[PDB]
Amino acid sequence: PDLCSRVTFVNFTVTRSSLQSQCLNEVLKAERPDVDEKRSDLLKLQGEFQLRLRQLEKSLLQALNEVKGRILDDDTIITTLENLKREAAEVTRKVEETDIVMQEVETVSQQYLPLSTACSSIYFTMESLKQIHFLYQYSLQFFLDIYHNVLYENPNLVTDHTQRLSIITKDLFQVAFNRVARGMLHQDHITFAMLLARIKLKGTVGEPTYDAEFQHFLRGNEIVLSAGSTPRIQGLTVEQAEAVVRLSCLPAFKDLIAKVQADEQFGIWLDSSSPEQTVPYLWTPATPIGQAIHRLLLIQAFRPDRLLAMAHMF
Amino acid sequence: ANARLAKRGGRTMAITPRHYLDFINHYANLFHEKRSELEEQQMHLNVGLRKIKETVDQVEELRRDLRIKSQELEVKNAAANDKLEYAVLISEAQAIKADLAAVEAKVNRSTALLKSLSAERERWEKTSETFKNQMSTIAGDCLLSAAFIAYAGYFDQQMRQNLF
């Protein structure tokens, strides 16, 4: 506090918007260099034109402030009229540059917005990763070196943007996992893989953002359980009964007790043996990833030992 | 907020009354400089609007002179046609018509000037009217800005936004 009192702190942290913009500019430079350079030139020209417009407003204020006479009987006011006309014409000419800027930014957004969202998510996961083991701590230069590896080392170096974007994304995920897990303990590799899987799952359209069942899968032990609720002990113990009661609050698992009582012959795919390979019941159609999430919830409820193997196969 | 961050488990810096003195000094300085800036802007806008009013008055005077001396040329032409000395009358009528051409050109040019400057006037008057509302919020705006500029300097974007 002795030093803290005398000085004020100016913290230069990293934000999601800044990181997304930086990654978008980098992928623009490494993907469409002409588009990137013309976008930079258009931004610079727009900035200098806005500066010129503000200078014109100040000059008009000063000219109407410091002549001290009749405007209609002077030639400085005639020059003022000429300036107003010519720079109203350049204000008119601003519109086409604005339209070209709009076209460029909409193309760039529609082509590389999910990539930059993945950029921000992966870097923030890497930064929050220090809360686990407090040994590995990575900086932003590590992420920038990862990008210098991704955008400049391409297998089959395709020349097609639609395939190249997907190739870059999957190569990014793979090499980020490799470069992080190379210096990170084997006990947490499945945790980092799960976080990267969540990032890609949120990025990929088609799977409806499994937030409720992910929240239950992460915080199923901390939720309040029913008091005095005693399910059947026909083939499952008290811990499995409590886990089934806790899991039954999900909309997918309504008739869990009825289904496990009816499926008496399937007493092996949910209890004993190795239930990771074959899981009973199901997730209306369901995506394969959603079926995997539902089977992972079932594994956590019934056989919590095989959770790591089921996470690996998920 | 520092207690909440400590309960969360992050790293914090203890706050001191030096921060309070710095915030109150920033509040005073910002209030004074914003008051001076808005006063200078209003002075400039008042000068501009008064000069535009004077120009409109001169335009109206030029229009009145134009129509009066147009009627004068019509009367002189009627008198010359009745009297149809003659060369001097023709020269006088030609001089009056040349003056009419000059005055009409000046009137049209001033009307074009007024039309071009009406686009600035329609926003200048709006800013002058909005000045009354924007001068009553300077205290709260300067308080918020000084508090942010002297207090929220250490935290991240989320905690800065929460404090604001």
Swiss-Prot record, chain B:
- Spell out the family assignment given in the record's similarity comment: Belongs to the dynein heavy chain family.
Task: Describe the disease involvement stated in the record for this chain.
Answer: Charcot-Marie-Tooth disease, axonal, type 2O: An axonal form of Charcot-Marie-Tooth disease, a disorder of the peripheral nervous system, characterized by progressive weakness and atrophy, initially of the peroneal muscles and later of the distal muscles of the arms. Charcot-Marie-Tooth disease is classified in two main groups on the basis of electrophysiologic properties and histopathology: primary peripheral demyelinating neuropathies (designated CMT1 when they are dominantly inherited) and primary peripheral axonal neuropathies (CMT2). Cortical dysplasia, complex, with other brain malformations 13: An autosomal dominant disorder characterized by global developmental delay with impaired intellectual development. Some patients show signs of peripheral neuropathy, such as abnormal gait and hyporeflexia. CDCBM13 is associated with variable neuronal migration defects resulting in cortical malformations.
Full-protein residues shown here are 3157 to 3529 of 4646
Could you name the domain of life of the organism this protein comes from? Eukaryota
Annotated membrane-spanning segments are none
Q: Where is the protein found, in the record's own terms?
A: Cytoplasm, Cytoskeleton
Sites of N6-acetyllysine modification = K115
Protein known as? Cytoplasmic dynein 1 heavy chain 1
Q: How does it assemble?
A: Homodimer. The cytoplasmic dynein 1 complex consists of two catalytic heavy chains (HCs) and a number of non-catalytic subunits presented by intermediate chains (ICs), light intermediate chains (LICs) and light chains (LCs); the composition seems to vary in respect to the IC, LIC and LC composition. The heavy chain homodimer serves as a scaffold for the probable homodimeric assembly of the respective non-catalytic subunits. The ICs and LICs bind directly to the HC dimer and dynein LCs assemble on the IC dimer. Interacts with DYNC1LI1; DYNC1LI1 and DYNC1LI2 bind mutually exclusive to DYNC1H1.
Q: Whose protein is this, by species?
A: Homo sapiens
What does the record say about domains?
Dynein heavy chains probably consist of an N-terminal stem (which binds cargo and interacts with other dynein components), and the head or motor domain. The motor contains six tandemly-linked AAA domains in the head, which form a ring. A stalk-like structure (formed by two of the coiled coil domains) protrudes between AAA 4 and AAA 5 and terminates in a microtubule-binding site. A seventh domain may also contribute to this ring; it is not clear whether the N-terminus or the C-terminus forms this extra domain.
The free-text function statement in the UniProt record for this protein reads: Cytoplasmic dynein 1 acts as a motor for the intracellular retrograde motility of vesicles and organelles along microtubules. Dynein has ATPase activity; the force-producing power stroke is thought to occur on release of ADP. Plays a role in mitotic spindle assembly and metaphase plate congression.
